[PDB]
Paper text:
KIF1A, a key member of the kinesin-3 family, is recognized for its high processivity and fast MT plus-end-directed motility. These attributes are crucial for the long-distance transport of cargoes in neurons. Mutations in the microtubule-associated motor protein KIF1A lead to severe neurological conditions known as KIF1A-associated neurological disorders (KAND). Here, we present 2.7-3.5 Å resolution structures of dimeric microtubule-bound KIF1A, including the pathogenic P305L mutant, across various nucleotide states.
In the presence of AMP-PNP (abbreviated as ANP in our maps and model names), we observed classes where KIF1A’s two motor domains are connected by its coiled-coil dimerization domain and engaged with the core of two adjacent tubulin heterodimers along an MT protofilament. The leading head, positioned closer to the MT plus-end, features a backward-oriented neck-linker and an open nucleotide-binding pocket, whereas the trailing head exhibits a docked, forward-oriented neck-linker and a closed nucleotide-binding pocket. Both heads contain AMP-PNP bound in their nucleotide-binding sites. In contrast, in the two-heads-bound configuration (MT-KIF1A-ANP-T23L1), clear cryo-EM densities reveal the neck-linkers of both trailing and leading heads, extending from the motor domain to the connecting coiled-coil dimerization domain. In this configuration, the neck-linker of the trailing head is docked onto the motor domain, while the neck-linker of the leading head remains undocked and oriented backward. However, distinct differences are evident in the KIF1A structure: the backward-oriented neck-linker of the leading head deviates more from the motor domain, taking a more direct, linear path between the two motor domains. Within the two-heads-bound structure of KIF1A, this proline marks the start of an α-helix that pairs with a partner α-helix to form the coiled-coil dimerization domain. Densities associated with the C-terminal tail of α-tubulin were only evident in the AMP-PNP state.
Numbering used by the authors:
A (entry chain K): 4 to 389
B (entry chain E): 1 to 451
C (entry chain B): 1 to 432
D (entry chain A): 114 to 226
C-alpha cells in the first residue's frame, strides 16, 4: 500500500492580515495550484494529492472542509483499517503556524475538534455497540513527547526525566517505562488528553502565540478478543494507532527567537531535516525497486540520525498503514516555505508500505496447515479419492 | 590490599602448605621466626605484602593460613619444626582418630565438633582483612579428610561468604599408581561438592609430576618434597599478579572471567614451562618462544591426559621476569598456526596474557635452576573428560558387588548417595561432550533471502 | 580563552595520559615540580589550555585520573611526573572490573561515577570558556570501556554544547590479550556512536608495525606506543596554543571532517619518522611530509585506505613553510589518487598551518583521515561477536551483573547499521 | 560583539568630517568573514545608508582551497555582497601565486607577499 496524502489550507492570522493579505493557494477537487507572487508570468505549478481541504472561507459551500469532513475522509478509514487488524498512523507536517496542532487536537471547548477526539469518540462508540457475550474489546493509551532528543511522558507528569529508547529484535524500536494506562470510557481518555496537553511544552513566538516546542506521539493499543468453545481465535487482533503532531520548521529572522527558544528551534529543524531526508529516500528506493526493475541490491535509509525517525521506523515504512496531513498557509510572504511542504508531500505520495495482520506464529502455522489439509481433502473428495 | 586466605586440609594439603610457605617466606625476605631484617636495615617499605602476611605492631609477620587435619602427627611435625614460631599457635587439629580413607567418617561422623572451630578462626582471619579477594583450598581426592571435610567446609563457606571466589588445588588420583584401595569412592563422592561449591578447580596428578621430574630435572628417585615445590611454584605464579608490579596484571576475578565459559566447566589444567636442572640450564636460551611452546607439549602436562584428543576452550598465560609483550604476541601467533592445537570455533580470541616483572626465586636445596624468564599456562580444555572416565570405570568395578560399602553406611551414609554422585558425574561428562562439538554447519542451518 | 578538561580511565588510558603530560610539559617548559623554566615567551601565552595556575607561580595540569584498581594510580605517582598532578583528582576504588564491561558500567562504576563527576564539575566551573573534553581509554578491557562510556553519557547529558573527543585503543585481529574483547568492544562502540563528536581509532598492531618497519626498533615496549599516541594528541590541539598562518580549532576539524553525524571515526597519523640513523639521508620538506602522510604503512588504525575511499582528511602542519607548496601538494595528492576520494565532496582535504614546530624538529605534521576502510575493523569485531553469542560463550558473567540478551542484540544491530552506512559511500559510481 | 563593533564605528565616525566611505576586508569561505560581514553590512546599511561601502574579499579558488565547506559559506554570502555593498573587489589566491611565481620569481611564496 501507499502513503495516503492529505493537504489542508488554512485562513489568515493577525500577522498576515496586518501585512499583505494576498492568497496564493487555489484548489479544485483533488488538485492544488500554487502561484509565485514574485513571478506572475510563470506557470501556476500544480500538485495532485489524495485529499485536499479548503478551510479559508467559513460560510461558503465551495468545497469547504470542516473538521468533520477531514475526519470522515481520513480518520474513519484509518479506524476501519485498525479494526481490520492493521497498525495505522496519521502524522502531521508543514511549517510553523499552519495547523498541525489544530488538525490533530483542535479546540476542545467547541464543535471544532481534532482528529484524535473524533477518532477516540468513534472507537468508543464502535466497541460499545458491537459488544457481545463472546466478543470483547480492550484499549490502552499512551502519550510521549520528544523535546530536545529526549523522550518525556505526558500522562504521568511526576516522572520528570528522559526515558530510555530500546530495540526489540522482532517489534523494532520502543520506549521503555512508558506509562501506558488502561481506559474504559470516553471521559477517561478525555481526562488523559487534557492532562497531556497541559503537560506539553508550549512557548510564544512571533509566528505563533502558542508554538509547539516538541514533537508528540499519541499511541492507542487496541485488542479484540473473540472467545468461543470450538477454537475461536482468542485476543486475535492487536492494532496500534499512532497519531503524531510534529513541531514545525522555523526561521530565526521571522521567529525572533533568542536563547532557549533558538536552541529549541535548532533541534526542531535538525529533526525535521532528518525526517525529510528519510522521506526522500524511502521514496526513491521504493519507486526504483518498484519501477527500475527488481535488483533490490542494497539501499540504506538513515533512520538512526534522529530519535524521531527512530521511533517512527515502522510507521514511515514497513509494517503500518500511514497517512500524512500537510498544513498550508495562504499568505504570499510564506510562499518559499509552503511550496517546500508541498514538494515533500509529493514525495510522500511515492512511498510504499508492507503491513500484515498480527497473530501468534504457532497459531499462524497451525491455521495455515489446517487450511491446507482442508483444501487437499476437498480436492481429493471432489476427484473421487477422498 | 589484595588479601587471600589459604586453607590446607589433610596430609597432602599440609605438606603442600609447608612448601608454599617456605617459598612465600623466601620471596618476601621473611625469616622463619617471622621477623623481616630488610625493613630494619632499609628503614621501611612495602615488603610485608598483605596478600599472605599480616603485620603486628612489634614487626612480626603472621601468615594468613589455616591448617586443618584429624591426625595430630602431620601438624605436630610443624609445631616443633623450623617454622614453629611463624604460625599462630591455633592450628585446628582434632585430638582424635582420622577419617580412615572414609568420606562418611570425615563428612558426617567426625567432621563435626572441629568444623565450628575452623569457621570461627576463618571468620577471625576474614575480619582482619580489607578487600578480601578469595580463598585457596588445598586438599586431596581419595583421602577421607581431604574429601569429606573439604566438602563440609566448602558447603559452609558458600553458605556464609557467598560472593568471594574459592579456587581449589587438588591431587586427582592417577590412572595406574595408587596409595589406597578405596580412592574411587571418595573421589566420586566429593565431585558432587566440588562441582557446585567451587569456582575453579586445578587438578594435578602425581604420575605426571614423577614423569616430569624423571625427564626434565634428571631426578631418578623423587619424593613428595619435589612435587610440593613444583606446586608451590605454580601457585606463586598464579598469585604473583597481585603482589608485584608488571606490564599487565591479572587478578583472581579475571581468571574466572576468561577461563570459565559456563558455570559447570571450571576444571582447567595447569603447566609450568621452564622446569629444568642447573646443568641443563646451560646449552639453552630459555626465550619466550621456547617456554610458550613447552607449555603446549603433551609430555609436560601435569595431568595424565593428551590435549591432542580434545579441544582448547580457553588459555591463560602468566609470564614472569625479563619478558616483553612483542615476543608474547609472536609466540601466540606461532601457536595459532599449528594444526595439532585445535581451538573450539566459538572462541576466536582464545588467549589471556599477563606479565609480571618479579622473576622466580630459587629455594636452597631445591632442584630447579635459576632462570630469567618463566611462564605458567592454564588451559580449560575437553581432554580432562578422559581423566574422569577412567575413574568412573574403576568405581563401577567395585560398586557392582558393593565392596567396601558397609564401612560407609556404618558412618552415617545410605547406599543411594553413591548412585546420585555417579549420575552427577555422568551429567558433567556429558556437558563436556556437548561443548567441544563444532557448531552445526552454518549454525542457522542455511539462509539467503532475496537481496 | 579555550580550555580543555582531560579524563583518563583504566591502565591504558592512565599510561597514555602520563606520557602525554610528560610530552606537553616538555613542550611548555614545565619542570616536574611544576615550575616554568622555558626560554620562549610564547610558551606561557596560552598555558591555560591545559594547566591551572597555583600560588607559588606553579602550574597544575587539568587532569582527572580514574580507575577501579589502585595499583595503576601508584605507578603514576611513583614516576618522573607523578608529583605534578594534584592528589585530589586521583579518584579510585577497590575490586576492579575484572575485564567485565557490566561491572565497569552497571555495578562498580555506578558508585564511583558520582565522585568523578564531582571532580569534573569542579574543574569545569573554574574554566573561563570551556572548549571540550578528551578521554583516553581502551575499548577491549573492563573499567576503561565501561566507565569511559558512562562518563561520556553523563557529560553529554550535562554539557551538550561542548566538544567530546576520545582516543580509544580498540582490539586488533592478531594481537589479542583478553578472551572477551569482542563483547566489550561491541558495547563500547554502541555507546560511542551515539555519545561522541570525534573518535580517533588506535590499534596496537599498527603501532607495532610502525615501530618495527619505520623506526627500525628491535625491542618496542608500551612506552614507545604511548610516545606515538601522545605526539598525535599534541598535534591535534596545537592550534589552540600557538599562533599560525592558518588556524584550526577542534570545531573546525569536526565541521570539515564529519559529513553526517554517525561517521566520526578517524584514522590518525604523524610525520616525520626517521629511525635515528636515516635522518641524515632524508631531506625534510613539505613534499616528504606529504609523501609519508598518506602512505598506507604509516597509519595508526591497521586499516588500509586503499580498500575504501576518503570521505575527508585533515592535515595540520607545524613549522615555517610556504602555503603555496602546501596547497599544491594537497591538490596533487587529490588528483593523482583520484580513485581514493569521493566525487560528491570537492576539495575534501582540510589544511592548517602552525608557526611553532616541536622542540627538536624544523618541520612536523599530523594527519586525521575519515575513510570507509574503517568498516573493516568493525566487521571483524562483529564476526567474533557472533561466534561467541550464538553459543552464549561467556554470557553468564555479564547477565549476573544486571544485563540481558536484548542489550547485546541491539548493540550488534547498531554496529552493523554503522558498517552499512560506511559501506554506502565505498563503491564508485554514485557520482554528481 | 556586533553592538560593541558598531559602537566603536560610531565613535570613529563622529570624529570624522566629510566621511567618504568604508573599506571592508573579509574572506569568503570562513565562518566569521561571511556571517559577521553579513551582520555588519546589514547594520551599516541601516544606520549610515548613503555612505559608500567598498569590499576587498578573497574568493574561493577553482582548484586549491583550505576547507571542505567553502562553497556553502561563499554562496550564503551572496545576498549581503549583492544588496548592501556598492562595489566589491574579488581576488583569488591561485592568481596571485602564479603572479609571484612568474613575475617576481618567488618559487615558494607565502601569505605575506
Ligand atoms: C637529532 C634529534 O633531535 O633526534 C630526534 C630523532 O632522531 C627522531 C628520529 C625522533 C626521536 O624519537 C624516537 O626515537 C622515537 C622512538 C619511539 C617512539 C617515537 C619516537 C627522538 O627520540 C625524539 C625527539 O623528539 C622530540 O623531542 C619532539 O619534540 C617530541 N617530544 C618527545 O619525543 C619527548 C620526549 C621526552 C619527553 C618529552 C617529549 C614531540 C613530537 C611531537 C609533538 C610533541 C613533541 C627528537 C627530536 C629526536 C630523538 C631524541 C632521538 C622522532 O620523534 C618524534 C616522534 O618526534 C621519531 O621520528 C621522529 C623524528 C626524528 O628524526
Ligand atoms: N603431591 C602430593 N600428594 C600427596 C602428598 N601427601 C599425600 N598425597 C596424596 O594423597 C593421597 C591420600 O590422601 P591423604 O592426603 O593422605 O588424606 P589424609 O589427609 O591423610 O586424610 P586421612 O585419610 O583421613 O588421613 C595419596 O594418594 C597421595 O598420593 C604430598 O605430600 N604431595
Ligand atoms: N483549517 C483551519 N481552519 C481554521 N483555523 C485553522 C485551520 N488550521 C489552522 N488554524 C488556526 O491557525 C493557527 C495555526 O494553527 P496551529 O495548529 O497552531 O499551527 P501549529 O503548527 O500546530 N503551531 P506550531 O506548533 O508552531 O507548528 C491556530 O490558531 C489554528 O487554530
Ligand atoms: N598502547 C598501549 N596499550 C595498552 C597498554 N596497556 C594495556 N594496553 C592494551 O589494553 C588492553 C587491556 O585493557 P586494560 O587497560 O587492561 O583495560 P582496563 O582493565 O579497563 O584498564 C590490551 O589489549 C592492551 O593491548 C599501554 O601501556 N599502551
Ligand atoms: Mg503546534
Ligand atoms: Mg592422613
Amino acid at each position: 500500500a501507499s502513503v495516503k496524502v492529505a493537504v489542508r489550507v488554512r485562513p489568515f492570522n493577525s500577522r498576515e492580515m496586518s501585512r499583505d493579505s494576498k492568497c496564493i493557494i487555489q484548489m479544485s477537487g483533488s488538485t492544488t495550484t500554487i502561484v509565485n507572487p514574485k513571478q506572475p508570468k510563470e506557470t501556476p505549478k500544480s500538485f495532485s494529492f489524495d485529499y485536499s481541504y479548503w478551510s479559508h472561507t467559513s460560510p461558503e459551500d465551495i468545497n469547504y472542509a470542516s473538521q468533520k469532513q477531514v475526519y470522515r475522509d481520513i480518520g474513519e478509514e484509518m479506524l476501519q483499517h485498525a479494526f481490520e487488524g492493521y497498525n495505522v498512523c496519521i502524522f502531521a507536517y508543514g511549517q510553523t503556524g499552519a495547523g498541525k496542532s489544530y488538525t490533530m487536537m483542535g479546540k476542545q471547548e467547541k464543535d471544532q475538534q481534532g482528529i484524535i477526539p473524533q477518532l477516540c469518540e468513534d472507537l468508543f462508540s464502535r466497541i460499545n455497540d458491537t459488544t457481545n457475550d463472546n466478543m470483547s474489546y480492550s484499549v490502552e493509551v499512551s502519550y510521549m513527547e520528544i523535546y530536545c532528543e529526549r523522550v518525556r511522558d505526558l500522562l504521568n507528569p511526576k516522572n520528570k526525566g528522559n526515558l530510555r529508547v530500546r530495540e526489540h529484535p522482532l517489534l523494532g524500536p520502543y520506549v521503555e517505562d512508558l506509562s501506558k494506562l488502561a481506559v474504559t470510557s470516553y471521559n477517561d481518555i478525555q481526562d488523559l488528553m487534557d492532562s497531556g496537553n497541559k503537560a506539553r511544552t508550549v512557548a510564544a513566538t512571533n509566528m505563533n502565540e502558542t508554538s509547539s516546542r516538541s514533537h508528540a506521539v499519541f499511541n492507542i493499543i487496541f485488542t479484540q478478543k473473540r472467545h468461543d468453545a470450538e477454537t475461536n481465535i482468542t485476543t486475535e487482533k492487536v492494532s496500534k494507532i499512532s497519531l503524531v503532531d510534529l513541531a514545525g520548521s522555523e526561521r530565526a529572522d521571522s521567529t525572533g527567537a533568542k536563547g532557549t527558544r533558538l536552541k529549541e528551534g535548532a533541534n526542531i529543524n535538525k529533526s525535521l531535516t532528518t525526517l525529510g531526508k528519510v522521506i526522500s529516500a524511502l521514496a526513491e528506493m521504493d519507486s526504483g525497486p518498484n519501477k527500475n526493475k527488481k535488483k533490490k541490491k542494497t539501499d540504506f535509509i538513515p533512520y538512526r540520525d534522529s530519535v524521531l525517525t527512530w521511533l517512527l521506523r515502522e510507521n514511515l515504512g514497513g509494517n503500518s498503514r500511514t497517512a500524512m496531513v500537510a498544513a498550508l498557509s495562504p499568505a504570499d510572504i510564506n510562499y518559499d516555505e509552503t511550496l517546500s511542504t508541498l514538494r515533500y508531500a509529493d514525495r510522500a505520495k511515492q512511498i510504499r508500505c508492507n503491513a500484515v495482520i498480527n497473530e501468534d506464529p504457532n497459531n499462524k502455522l497451525i491455521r495455515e496447515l489446517k487450511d491446507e489439509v482442508t483444501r487437499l481433502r476437498d480436492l481429493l473428495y471432489a476427484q473421487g479419492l477422498g | 590490599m589484595r588479601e587471600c586466605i589459604s586453607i590446607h586440609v589433610g596430609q597432602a594439603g599440609v605438606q603442600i602448605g609447608n612448601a608454599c610457605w617456605e617459598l612465600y617466606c623466601l620471596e618476601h625476605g621473611i625469616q622463619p621466626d617471622g621477623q623481616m631484617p630488610s625493613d630494619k636495615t632499609i628503614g621501611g617499605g612495602d615488603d610485608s605484602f598483605n596478600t599472605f602476611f599480616s603485620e603486628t605492631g612489634a614487626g612480626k609477620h603472621v601468615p594468613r593460613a589455616v591448617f586443618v587435619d584429624l591426625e595430630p602427627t602431620v601438624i605436630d611435625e610443624v609445631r616443633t619444626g623450623t617454622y614453629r614460631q611463624l604460625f599462630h599457635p591455633e592450628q585446628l587439629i582434632t585430638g582424635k582418630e582420622d577419617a580412615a580413607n572414609n568420606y562418611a567418617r570425615g563428612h558426617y561422623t567426625i567432621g563435626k565438633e572441629i568444623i565450628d572451630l575452623v569457621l570461627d578462626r576463618i571468620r577471625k582471619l576474614a575480619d582482619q582483612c580489607t578487600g578480601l579477594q578469595g580463598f585457596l583450598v588445598f586438599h586431596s581426592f581419595g583421602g577421607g579428610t581431604g574429601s569429606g571435610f573439604t566438602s563440609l567446609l566448602m558447603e559452609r563457606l558458600s553458605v556464609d561468604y557467598g560472593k568471594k571466589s574459592k579456587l581449589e588445588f587438588s591431587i586427582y588420583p592417577a590412572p595406574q599408581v595408587s596409595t589406597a584401595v578405596v580412592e574411587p569412592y571418595n573421589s566420586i563422592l566429593t565431585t558432587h561438592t566440588t562441582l557446585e561449591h567451587s569456582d575453579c578447580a586445578f587438578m594435578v596428578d602425581n604420575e605426571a609430576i614423577y614423569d616430569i621430574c624423571r625427564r626434565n630435572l634428571d631426578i631418578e628417585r623423587p619424593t613428595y618434597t619435589n612435587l610440593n615445590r613444583l606446586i608451590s611454584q605454580i601457585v606463586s605464579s598464579i598469585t604473583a599478579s597481585l603482589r608485584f608490579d608488571g606490564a599487565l596484571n591479572v587478578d583472581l576475578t579475571e581468571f574466572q572471567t576468561n577461563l570459565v565459559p559456563y558455570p559447570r566447566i571450571h576444571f582447567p589444567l595447569a603447566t609450568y614451562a621452564p622446569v629444568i636442572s642447573a646443568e641443563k640450564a646451560y646449552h639453552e636460551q630459555l626465550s619466550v618462544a621456547e617456554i610458550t611452546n613447552a607449555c603446549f607439549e603433551p609430555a609436560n602436562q601435569m595431568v595424565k591426559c593428551d590435549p591432542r584428543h580434545g579441544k582448547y576452550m580457553a588459555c591463560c598465560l602468566l609470564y614472569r621476569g625479563d619478558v616483553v609483550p612483542k615476543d608474547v604476541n609472536a609466540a601466540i601467533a606461532t601457536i595459532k598456526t599449528k594444526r595439532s592445537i585445535q581451538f573450539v570455533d566459538w572462541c576466536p580470541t582464545g588467549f589471556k596474557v599477563g606479565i609480571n616483572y618479579q622473576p622466580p626465586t630459587v629455594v636452597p636445596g631445591g632442584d630447579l635452576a635459576k632462570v630469567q624468564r618463566a611462564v605458567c599456562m592454564l588451559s580449560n580444555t575437553t581432554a580432562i573428560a578422559e581423566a574422569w572416565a577412567r575413574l568412573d570405570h574403576k568405581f563401577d568395578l567395585m560398586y557392582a558387588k558393593r565392596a567396601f560399602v558397609h564401612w560407609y553406611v556404618g558412618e552415617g551414609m545410605e547406599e543411594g548417595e553413591f548412585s546420585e554422585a555417579r549420575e552427577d558425574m555422568a551429567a558433567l561428562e556429558k556437558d563436556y561432550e556437548e561443548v567441544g562439538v563444532d557448531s552445526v554447519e552454518g549454525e542457522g542451518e542455511e539462509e539467503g533471502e532475496e537481496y | 580563552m579555550r580550555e580543555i578538561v582531560h579524563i583518563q580511565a583504566g591502565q591504558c588510558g592512565n599510561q597514555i595520559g602520563a606520557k602525554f603530560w610528560e610530552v606537553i610539559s616538555d613542550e611548555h617548559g614545565i619542570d616536574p615540580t611544576g615550575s616554568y623554566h622555558g626560554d620562549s615567551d610564547l610558551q606561557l601565552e596560552r598555558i591555560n589550555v591545559y594547566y591551572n595556575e597555583a600560588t607559588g607561580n606553579k602550574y597544575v595540569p587539568r587532569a582527572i585520573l580514574v580507575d577501579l584498581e589502585p595499583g595503576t594510580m601508584d605507578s603514576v605517582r611513583s614516576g618522573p611526573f607523578g608529583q605534578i598532578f594534584r592528589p585530589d583528582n586521583f579518584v579510585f576504588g577497590q575490586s576492579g572490573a575484572g575485564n567485565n564491561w557490566a561491572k565497569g558500567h552497571y555495578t562498580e562504576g555506578a558508585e564511583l561515577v558520582d565522585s568523578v563527576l564531582d571532580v569534573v564539575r569542579k574543574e569545569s566551573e573554574s574554566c573561563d570558556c570551556l572548549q571540550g573534553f578528551q578521554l583516553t581509554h581502551s575499548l577491549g578491557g573492563g573499567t576503561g570501556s565501561g566507565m569511559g562510556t558512562l562518563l561520556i553519557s553523563k557529560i553529554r547529558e550535562e554539557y551538550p554544547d561542548r566538544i567530546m573527543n576520545t582516543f580509544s585503543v580498540m582490539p586488533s585481529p592478531k594481537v589479542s590479550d583478553t578472551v572477551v574483547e569482542p563483547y566489550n568492544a561491541t558495547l563500547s562502540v554502541h555507546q560511542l556512536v551515539e555519545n561522541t563528536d570525534e573518535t580517533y581509532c588506535i590499534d596496537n598492531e599498527a603501532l607495532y608495525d610502525i615501530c618495527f618497519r619505520t623506526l627500525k626498533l628491535t625491542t618496542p615496549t608500551y612506552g614507545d606506543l604511548n610516545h606515538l599516541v601522545s605526539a598525535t594528541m599534541s598535534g591535534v590541539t596545537t592550534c589552540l596554543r600557538f599562533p599560525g598562518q592558518l588556524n584550526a580549532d577542534l570545531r573546525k576539524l569536526a565541521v570539515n571532517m564529519v559529513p553526517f553525524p554517525r561517521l566520526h571515526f578517524f584514522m590518525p597519523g604523524f610525520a616525520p619518522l626517521t629511525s635515528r640513523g636515516s635522518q641524515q639521508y632524508r631531506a625534510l620538506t613539505v613534499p616528504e611530509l606529504t609523501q609519508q602522510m598518506f602512505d598506507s604503512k604509516n597509519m595508526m588504525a591497521a586499516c588500509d585506505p586503499r580498500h575504501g575511499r576518503y570521505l575527508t582528511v585533515a592535515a595540520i602542519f607545524r613549522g615555517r613553510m610556504s602555503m603555496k607548496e602546501v596547497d599544491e601538494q594537497m591538490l596533487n595528492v587529490q588528483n593523482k589518487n583520484s580513485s581514493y576520494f569521493v566525487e560528491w565532496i570537492p576539495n575534501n582535504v582540510k589544511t592548517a598551518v602552525c608557526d611553532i614546530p616541536p622542540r627538536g624538529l624544523k618541520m612536523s605534521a599530523t594527519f586525521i583521515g575519515n575513510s570507509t576502510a574503517i568498516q573493516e575493523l568493525f566487521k571483524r569485531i562483529s564476526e567474533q561477536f557472533t561466534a561467541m553469542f550464538r553459543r552464549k560463550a561467556f554470557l553468564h558473567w555479564y547477565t549476573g551483573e544486571g544485563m540481558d540478551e536484548m542489550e547485546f542484540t541491539e548493540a550488534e544491530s547498531n554496529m552493523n547499521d554503522l558498517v552499512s552506512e560506511y559501506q554506502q559511500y565505498q563503491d564508485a559510481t554514485a557520482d554528481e
